[PDB]
C-alpha cells in the first residue's frame, strides 16, 4: 500500500494540540483543526 | 492489510506527538 | 491519551489509505465534517 507523504506529520500535529488543549469532543475538535490548518495554507 | 498498517501509523504518531 | 483518539484517527487513516486523496487536510475536514453530521 502507497503511504501518501505527510499522513504521520499530520496525525502528529492534531495529536499535539488535542493534548495541549484536552478538548472534550475530539471529532468537533478535529473539523475545527483541519479546517484552520486548511486556511493558515 | 490496511486496517493493521493505518493502527500502526496512528500508533506511532501519537507517541511521536507524546 | 484521551480514550477515543487512536480509533477516532484510525478511521481517517483507513480511508486516506484506502482512497489515496491527493490533500490530506481537506480530506480530513471532509472525513470529520461527515462524522461530526452522522452522529
Same mark, same amino acid.
Given at each position: 500500500? /502507497?503511504? %501518501? &507523504?505527510? +499522513?504521520? =506529520?499530520?496525525?502528529?500535529? @492534531?495529536?499535539?494540540?488535542?493534548?495541549? /488543549?484536552? %478538548? &472534550?469532543? +475530539?471529532? =468537533?475538535?478535529?473539523?475545527? @483543526?483541519?479546517?484552520?490548518?486548511?486556511?493558515?495554507? | 492489510?490496511?486496517?493493521?498498517?493505518?493502527?500502526?501509523?496512528?500508533?506511532?504518531?501519537?507517541?511521536?506527538?507524546?
Amino acid at each position: 500500500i /502507497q503511504i %501518501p &507523504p505527510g +499522513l504521520t =506529520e499530520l496525525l502528529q500535529g @492534531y495529536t499535539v494540540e488535542v493534548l495541549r /488543549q484536552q %478538548p &472534550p469532543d +475530539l471529532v =468537533e475538535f478535529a473539523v475545527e @483543526y483541519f479546517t484552520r490548518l486548511r486556511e493558515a495554507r | 492489510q490496511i486496517e493493521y498498517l493505518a493502527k500502526q501509523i496512528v500508533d506511532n504518531a501519537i507517541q511521536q506527538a507524546k
